[PDB]
Paper text:
Validated targets for the development of new antibacterial agents include bacterial enzymes DNA gyrase and topoisomerase IV (topo IV), which belong to type IIA topoisomerases. During DNA replication, DNA gyrase removes the positive supercoils ahead of the replication fork, while topo IV unlinks replicated daughter chromosomes. On the other hand, GyrB or ParE inhibitors block the ATPase function of the enzymes, depriving the bacterial cell of the topoisomerase activity required for the replication process.
The binding mode of 7a resembled the binding mode of E in its complex with S. aureus GyrB24.28 The pyrrolamide moiety formed a network of hydrogen bonds with Asp75, Thr167, and water molecules, as well as several hydrophobic contacts with Val45, Val73, Ile96, Met97, Val122, and Val169 in the hydrophobic pocket of the ATP-binding site of GyrB. The strongest interaction formed was a salt bridge between the carboxylate group of 7a and the Arg138 guanidinium side chain. The morpholine ring was oriented perpendicular to the central benzothiazole core and pointed toward the lipophilic floor of the binding site, where it formed a hydrogen bond with a water molecule. The crystal structure of inhibitor 7a in complex with P. aeruginosa DNA gyrase was resolved, confirming its binding mode at the ATP-binding site. 7a inhibited DNA gyrase from all strains with a potent IC50 of <10 nM. Compound 7a showed balanced dual enzyme inhibition of DNA gyrase and topo IV from E. coli, potent antibacterial activity, and good solubility. A morpholino substituent on C4 of the central core yielded favorable ADME (absorption, distribution, metabolism, excretion) properties for the lead compound 7a.
Residue numbers in the entry: 14 to 219
The structure:
Amino acid sequence: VLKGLDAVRKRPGMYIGDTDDGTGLHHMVFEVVDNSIDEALAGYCSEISITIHTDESITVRDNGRGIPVDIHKEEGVSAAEVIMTVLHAGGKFDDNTYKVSGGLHGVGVSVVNALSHELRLTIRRHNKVWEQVYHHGVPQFPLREVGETDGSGTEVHFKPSPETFSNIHFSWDILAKRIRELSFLNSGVGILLRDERTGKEELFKY
Ligand SMILES: Cc1[nH]c(C(=O)Nc2nc3c(N4CCOCC4)cc(C(=O)O)cc3s2)c(Cl)c1Cl
Ligand SMILES: [Ca+2]
Ligand SMILES: [Ca+2]
């Protein structure tokens, strides 16, 4: 019986949705972006960028508070690592978790992490820069300090795993349609979509 991220990599459809028709693939982006939008709603984030790279990887960057980096007392690793590597169980008995189709809503970034062959996390918090890298959800090394900064926020770069997803090709139109909606709802945040494949860029703002 598989638990945790093992369960996710075994049956990714139960979490992210269909892994062949583009549903799950675009859900990966929105699961990351929704965490930034959480920062916007809380009044800490005014800037989100979403970049599609020429290798069909994604970079989401926000100017929110930065994922917490303190050592977690119970796990003995950074809070950020716990958030990245533990399947969140708080939603399991909430109505809003379960979709008619397309997997789960609010699955968490740890599911994005599990289904990415590489995920690079860069946090600006407490005037330091912190970085962690993962592969298929497994940390390569503990979160570590790599510099100083005068700002704060979170950057996630992820490469969808071809062993989970087929037809790995992001759609500007699918992303823009949701981003329009999020921009409408969250008027204090500007959301930049950047497509390095086509050279196209657009800033979405209420
Ligand atoms: C691109 C991107 N951005 C983020 C991102 O900013 N997440 C953040 N989460 C929190 C946070 N948690 C605590 C645990 O319950 C959920 C909220 C607390 C604090 C704080 O108390 O200071 C701040 C933050 S910032 C994520 Cl995740 C991703 Cl992916
Ligand atoms: Ca959420
Ligand atoms: Ca900030």
